[PDB]
Amino acid sequence: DQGCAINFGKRELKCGDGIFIFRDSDDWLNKYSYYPEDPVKLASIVKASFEEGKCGLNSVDSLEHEMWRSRADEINAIFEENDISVVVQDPKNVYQRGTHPFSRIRKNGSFIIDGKSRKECPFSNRVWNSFQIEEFGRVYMDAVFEYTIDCDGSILGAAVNGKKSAHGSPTFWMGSHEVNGTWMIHTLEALDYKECEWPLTHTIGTSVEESEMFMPRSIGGPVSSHNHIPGYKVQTNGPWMQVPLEVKREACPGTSVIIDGNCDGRGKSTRSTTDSGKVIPEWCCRSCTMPPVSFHGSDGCWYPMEIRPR
Amino acid sequence: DQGCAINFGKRELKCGDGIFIFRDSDDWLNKYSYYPEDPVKLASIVKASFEEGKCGLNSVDSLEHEMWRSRADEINAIFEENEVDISVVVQDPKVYQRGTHPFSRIRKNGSFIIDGKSRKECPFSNRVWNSFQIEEFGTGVTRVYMDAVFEYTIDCDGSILGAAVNGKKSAHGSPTFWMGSHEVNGTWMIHTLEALDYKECEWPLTHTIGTSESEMFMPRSIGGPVSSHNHIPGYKVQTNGPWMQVPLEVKREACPGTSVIIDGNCDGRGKSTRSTTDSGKVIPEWCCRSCTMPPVSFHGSDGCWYPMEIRP
């Protein structure tokens, strides 16, 4: 990796060789060309998997969904030639957990790629995480017949430096820093809602319990010391199911939080506006930090589980 | 951090933002100009430590030793001008060991030996080891600034470390250490390891990658990441290894003029032994228990050495 970074805090320019992790993989929104195994073996794989009694798939991330939407037509043409057709519907960005791996090779039935749990096949009868990537990047994919719950490590990244760190992915970016001795989040952009856990071999400083972390493990978020914000426990019932998120350290427009010690807390997150689009600027919280945190997603301003409407 | 990686001939260019670590920290050998706390208060600190019963210091890294060598004279001059019967002399550990005291808080020619042989009068007990912290990492056109600390700590300083992982690639870094792992057919395994000192500060738990103590190649106490990335298959922890040498280079190749054959009959797990004997003659009769086909061999001061699993 022959490159040439430049800092501005410590004022370096140092060039040479090493390891680089770019965020801009979060910005190359559509440049990949996902080529699965081949236009033949994949067809037989899905045909067999349907023939065993798996109604439809369940994408794991936006990359899988894009690949399937682009390559449904080739598989349909192949089957035409050699009684099943794949119809790729749309989840907004809320890829949930399927509970089956692919199956081994040996009316108009359908293999819905990721559809609503319409009482005809629940999430139980779906294949979720049964691909793995061989080339970093055009990306080639290979099928797998073993169930897994950890995300694919071939596309992840992590890095630490002097008082700086960053957990990356093409659809995720968390950036921590150390101030006054401790490590705490300061950037967080999520473009999906995955449910694959972060692998241990790509976490930095795995020496924590799952009770101080900000982003929970199941939603997919590194299990480390860098992943937590002081004064806030795990965000189980957070606003994680939304479209592109951003965790921000500022009170949401028109509202205010006054640090108290008498108002109940630790329930579920609540939007700043009511169901009729009216703000409620009467927010309290228990012992929290001086500024509040607030997500910025699909509906807009949400608040963490420690900030309640008084 | 707006930098990028370039491919020659292919003439691609991918710039942006992120985190960048470079090996070349093990290439830039002499540009640092270390500045201590200040010319005046460091003198008072070492004077107070001497008054409380600490014979001398003990450097931990090459950076501290070079700083002391460069800046002993200023402290000597300040001491002279303040009329005090002390003077610091700095010797030369070729191998930095462990003291047991932090700097003491401020409130015939005595000797405050920086790092010299344990001459049965100033043992390691009366020595200060790890009492500094880099605050700013300089500007350059680098000038590392150091601030005292009065609490004993056995971890190294994180302001100069760095770790990174990517698709099937990893690297733990320092200006005096570079381990680089990769993932081939399953697990992770070292493929490059260059050490320039013999430190004894443990790697910090917050700058490791995959912290999930009997398979690690480089031991913990010598100072080496506690991670799954830190091991070589078939070779267990290197307690009595050849770590005490000047720049090492863990190489995966047979040693010159020798030969290794895997055997299920010979002894193992002893101590590291050099390829050439005490008289400069090789011994090409090397055996190994369960090991791997390409043997590993530390290349240090005297040349070839061998791990603890390979015996003559």
Side-chain angles (χ1 to χ4, degrees):
Chain A
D1 289 345
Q2 323 298 307
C4 295
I6 181 191
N7 204 306
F8 271 143
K10 66 211 284 163
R11 191 50 87 107
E12 81 176 10
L13 161 63
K14 66 173 46 190
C15 294
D17 162 347
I19 303 265
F20 313 119
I21 165 161
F22 296 110
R23 161 171 33 177
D24 284 21
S25 206
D26 209 7
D27 285 329
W28 309 127
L29 260 298
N30 269 301
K31 204 175 176 184
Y32 310 83
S33 298
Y34 313 83
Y35 293 6
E37 200 87 61
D38 70 346
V40 179
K41 165 147 187 79
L42 181 57
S44 47
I45 279 196
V46 47
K47 166 189 161 217
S49 293
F50 163 59
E51 279 188 288
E52 328 279 13
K54 273 142 188 166
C55 55
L57 203 80
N58 215 359
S59 314
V60 66
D61 65 17
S62 198
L63 281 77
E64 222 190 1
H65 194 61
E66 293 177 350
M67 181 255 298
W68 273 115
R69 186 267 301 183
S70 88
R71 292 254 141 68
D73 255 23
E74 268 99 337
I75 307 168
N76 284 314
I78 186 167
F79 270 117
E80 178 39 66
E81 153 55 51
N82 302 65
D83 74 299
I84 61 171
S85 68
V86 283
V87 281
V88 192
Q89 309 174 322
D90 190 79
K92 282 89 167 163
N93 273 325
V94 185
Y95 316 107
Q96 306 226 13
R97 197 171 269 172
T99 81
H100 269 106
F102 296 161
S103 205
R104 196 154 271 100
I105 288 268
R106 299 173 175 85
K107 267 291 304 304
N108 177 14
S110 295
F111 201 76
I112 71 200
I113 285 315
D114 45 17
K116 326 312 160 187
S117 185
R118 305 152 271 200
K119 293 179 179 179
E120 55 107 23
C121 183
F123 283 131
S124 166
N125 312 1
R126 323 202 160 201
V127 187
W128 176 51
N129 203 351
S130 286
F131 277 120
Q132 76 185 6
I133 278 154
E134 54 200 68
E135 187 69 32
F136 199 104
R138 182 170 294 107
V139 161
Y140 299 149
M141 285 173 189
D142 271 3
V144 166
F145 313 85
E146 280 219 51
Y147 188 42
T148 313
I149 78 196
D150 296 88
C151 318
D152 197 335
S154 314
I155 43 176
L156 312 166
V160 72
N161 219 351
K163 307 168 179 214
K164 275 194 318 302
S165 90
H167 296 70
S169 193
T171 76
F172 178 60
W173 183 270
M174 161 191 305
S176 309
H177 56 45
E178 154 175 69
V179 175
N180 192 31
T182 51
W183 282 95
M184 53 176 270
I185 322 180
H186 82 284
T187 290
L188 204 155
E189 314 147 14
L191 265 66
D192 282 28
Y193 167 68
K194 309 186 270 184
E195 208 138 345
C196 64
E197 313 190 359
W198 202 267
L200 285 170
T201 87
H202 294 62
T203 299
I204 290 174
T206 312
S207 289
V208 315
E209 67 279 46
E210 307 171 27
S211 193
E212 314 285 318
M213 288 159 25
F214 196 61
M215 189 195 216
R217 194 202 270 222
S218 41
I219 318 304
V223 191
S224 77
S225 44
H226 302 212
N227 192 31
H228 100 288
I229 283 190
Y232 298 91
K233 287 194 147 36
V234 279
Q235 308 283 67
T236 326
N237 308 278
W240 299 112
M241 278 215 200
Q242 321 286 124
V243 310
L245 271 173
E246 271 216 84
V247 169
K248 285 199 169 300
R249 206 71 180 279
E250 92 161 23
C252 261
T255 42
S256 55
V257 199
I258 40 185
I259 307 95
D260 265 326
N262 64 34
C263 59
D264 37 359
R266 290 290 298 180
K268 293 179 179 179
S269 77
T270 321
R271 186 166 68 183
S272 84
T273 75
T274 179
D275 54 12
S276 302
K278 331 287 192 52
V279 309
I280 38 168
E282 50 177 306
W283 295 90
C284 82
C285 183
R286 216 80 74 86
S287 52
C288 324
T289 42
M290 277 336 269
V293 317
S294 47
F295 306 75
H296 283 2
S298 197
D299 300 288
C301 274
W302 295 76
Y303 270 84
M305 332 204 312
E306 279 91 7
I307 296 180
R308 306 309 293 209
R310 185 195 291 149
Chain B
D1 264 15
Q2 263 204 350
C4 55
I6 177 175
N7 198 295
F8 294 98
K10 165 142 201 163
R11 42 185 39 75
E12 77 145 309
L13 242 184
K14 176 182 43 207
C15 307
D17 190 310
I19 297 281
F20 312 87
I21 70 171
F22 300 95
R23 182 200 322 216
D24 275 43
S25 270
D26 289 345
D27 275 287
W28 322 129
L29 259 282
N30 268 312
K31 184 143 96 149
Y32 295 98
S33 325
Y34 318 96
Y35 290 32
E37 266 269 345
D38 50 345
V40 185
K41 196 159 55 184
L42 201 73
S44 66
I45 286 178
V46 308
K47 168 182 181 296
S49 298
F50 175 82
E51 273 196 288
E52 260 176 30
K54 323 266 182 57
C55 266
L57 205 81
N58 214 337
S59 317
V60 54
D61 222 5
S62 294
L63 284 75
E64 211 185 348
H65 186 63
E66 159 69 14
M67 181 255 268
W68 277 115
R69 162 197 288 111
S70 308
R71 311 269 170 170
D73 255 22
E74 271 187 346
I75 275 144
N76 274 311
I78 300 303
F79 271 149
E80 201 156 50
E81 187 163 291
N82 294 7
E83 162 56 80
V84 50
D85 80 8
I86 197 154
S87 88
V88 280
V89 300
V90 182
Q91 294 300 320
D92 212 59
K94 293 236 233 80
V95 195
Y96 307 114
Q97 313 240 330
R98 205 183 261 174
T100 86
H101 276 101
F103 265 131
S104 64
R105 206 165 285 99
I106 318 105
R107 307 179 184 94
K108 185 43 191 303
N109 289 337
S111 166
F112 194 80
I113 39 184
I114 286 315
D115 42 357
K117 294 172 291 163
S118 183
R119 295 176 64 186
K120 293 179 179 179
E121 55 99 26
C122 282
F124 288 135
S125 169
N126 315 136
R127 277 171 200 246
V128 186
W129 184 52
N130 213 358
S131 289
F132 276 120
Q133 273 164 200
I134 297 109
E135 40 170 337
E136 156 80 339
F137 205 70
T139 323
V141 79
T142 324
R143 284 83 156 244
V144 160
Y145 296 159
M146 292 175 166
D147 287 354
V149 159
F150 323 109
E151 178 41 350
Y152 192 46
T153 315
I154 37 178
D155 300 359
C156 322
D157 209 357
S159 312
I160 65 174
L161 312 166
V165 73
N166 210 1
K168 307 195 172 302
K169 262 208 314 295
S170 158
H172 294 66
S174 191
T176 51
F177 173 59
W178 181 264
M179 161 185 318
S181 323
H182 62 62
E183 167 171 71
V184 281
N185 197 36
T187 47
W188 297 84
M189 51 157 266
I190 305 186
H191 78 291
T192 282
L193 203 159
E194 309 154 13
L196 260 64
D197 293 4
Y198 172 67
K199 315 171 300 298
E200 274 196 350
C201 68
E202 308 182 358
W203 203 261
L205 269 150
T206 86
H207 292 59
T208 78
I209 286 177
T211 189
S212 278
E213 293 177 350
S214 199
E215 164 105 335
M216 327 171 31
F217 197 54
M218 203 183 214
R220 201 174 83 120
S221 40
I222 317 304
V226 184
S227 76
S228 42
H229 295 223
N230 169 30
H231 84 97
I232 276 189
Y235 293 168
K236 272 172 66 179
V237 64
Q238 298 297 344
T239 312
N240 320 287
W243 307 107
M244 283 262 268
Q245 317 293 121
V246 313
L248 290 102
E249 287 211 85
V250 158
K251 284 205 177 305
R252 204 74 177 276
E253 86 152 38
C255 176
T258 299
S259 315
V260 196
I261 51 153
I262 304 189
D263 161 79
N265 264 277
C266 72
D267 50 353
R269 298 296 298 178
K271 310 189 320 289
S272 86
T273 189
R274 187 167 74 197
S275 81
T276 77
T277 180
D278 41 358
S279 169
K281 306 168 180 60
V282 309
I283 39 185
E285 55 172 299
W286 293 95
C287 83
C288 207
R289 269 179 186 259
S290 53
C291 317
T292 88
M293 263 296 166
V296 77
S297 56
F298 306 80
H299 300 291
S301 324
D302 305 359
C304 260
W305 286 74
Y306 266 66
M308 314 207 321
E309 295 76 40
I310 306 182
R311 317 300 290 167

